[PDB]
Design a protein around this nucleic acid. Sequence first.
RNA 1: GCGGGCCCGGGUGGAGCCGCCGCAGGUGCAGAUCUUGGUGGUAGUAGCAAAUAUUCAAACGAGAACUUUGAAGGCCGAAGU
Lengths: 107, 67, 52, 153, 50, 60
Amino acid sequence: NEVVTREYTINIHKRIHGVGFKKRAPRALKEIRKFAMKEMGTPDVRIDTRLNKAVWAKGIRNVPYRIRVRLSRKRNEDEDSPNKLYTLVTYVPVTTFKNLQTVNVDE
Amino acid sequence: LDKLIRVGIILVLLIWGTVLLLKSIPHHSNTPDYQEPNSNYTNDGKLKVSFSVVRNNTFHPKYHELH
Amino acid sequence: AVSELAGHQTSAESWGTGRAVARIPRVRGGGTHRSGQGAFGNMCRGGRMFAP
Amino acid sequence: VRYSLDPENPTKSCKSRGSNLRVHFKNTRETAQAIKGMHIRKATKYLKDVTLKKQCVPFRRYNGGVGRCAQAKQWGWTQGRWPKKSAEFLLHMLKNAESNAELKGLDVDSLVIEHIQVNKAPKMRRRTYRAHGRINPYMSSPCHIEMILTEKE
Amino acid sequence: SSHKTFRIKRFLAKKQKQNRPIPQWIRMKTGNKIRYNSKRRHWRRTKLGL
Amino acid sequence: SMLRLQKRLASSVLRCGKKKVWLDPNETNEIANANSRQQIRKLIKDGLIIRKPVTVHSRA
RNA sequence: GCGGGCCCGGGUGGAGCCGCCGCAGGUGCAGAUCUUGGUGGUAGUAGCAAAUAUUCAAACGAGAACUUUGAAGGCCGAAGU
Ligand SMILES: [Mg+2]
Ligand SMILES: [Mg+2]
Ligand SMILES: [Mg+2]
Ligand SMILES: [Mg+2]
């Protein structure tokens, strides 16, 4: 219901188009956050550190065009915050992005 | 006698509380005047920012005269 | 009577023309409030009364 | 203390005020004018929307250089901003007034802001350094804010 | 300067001892008109022009 | 919460630059109460804080 | 009362004040780029643009873009930041 997990391939290339060299990777992470917020209705999105390393692997001017990430929605077990649920985004190492779809990882 | 028993209870409670809870505590250092010295130093800083500003000759790059 | 030294104990010179001031003797130098203020005049604060 | 525009029915009215609050006077005055006359719950919701930039505060008197926004069309006005510090400062005042009403024994969900007033507070002084060895004042503009809530429903 | 003379060191020591604030119990005296030291010296401004 | 003192002292104890000083991100509480040295050396012995190797500058 | 001004009513205020006959003066302000102190429009405006650059997670904390820790990406590049 609200604990599902699934994989997505975000096209960073068409989201960071026309941005400056020094504001490209941070814009890529902003777009990843926006993608997670739009897909999963959770204002609280937590980005895995390995995802940040994958984004920043090729420096700040050159960001990979494609990247496949897992979008997992959690319960926020103990925090008494207004946001009941949060989304965790995890990097998925992928060789090639050809004919890859948004496969839902059943639990 | 009730007052005496209350005093005893308070003392024991205080001892227990200190032993199982409070951390390092200063003996006595003429407890700082900071409680009102905060406002006193606020007034002092208002005085400090009121330091006199020295006069200066105003720059003005004028053109030429006339002949 | 007033003291003969009242108001003349200061050493004030009038700033010349070419400055926004109004040609009144003013206190010379210093980093004080009483610096470039005004003296020797009956219209100035402190000053000296007219016809002592 | 003395309140301007004393309540008509003191039995069912609460009070709240603050002295020497370090918040801009003009923004606070505009926010107080926008919030005046609202219900307490509506006022809190409007302030929270202002903090989230979902609703704006129309700038009517002190509007020199203020930009335009589409949010201002709700008020029949063109100028508008989203003052955050003023909204938080008077939202704390709303919380204090609600606490005062609850202690006094009043219905919290029937209160409206009948009176709200912002007055200038004594200025703090700081200095800034300019060209050719000049020093100009760099001074804050705090304000005094007092308001009265009345149970009207 | 780390190469100061004895007189300069004594002068600096006296200034440092005088830089302390006023004790609180002075304010509780009957005929007191003093609220703060008003002679505090900081090392950024009023550079003690020896 | 605040571990600049521990890193500064561990740099001197290990005679490194503190660029190579590695404070354990999990057990920061045990690092926090090590204000004096000869107690930071105890943490070095326990392996909580380690000196990181120098950055590789290859010559091949 | 032509006028210079003055006499009463109300409010605040808490300790001295005035009329008349004479005497005396440091005795009446709109200006002097007058002196001192305070306050406006400007104006929530100019501005917070010299030297490539930050991001993620956690901790303390009422409160975190600026604190600390770890990871990543950078710069100073032995006449060095
Ligand atoms: Mg200069
Ligand atoms: Mg200096
Ligand atoms: Mg602007
Ligand atoms: Mg270079």
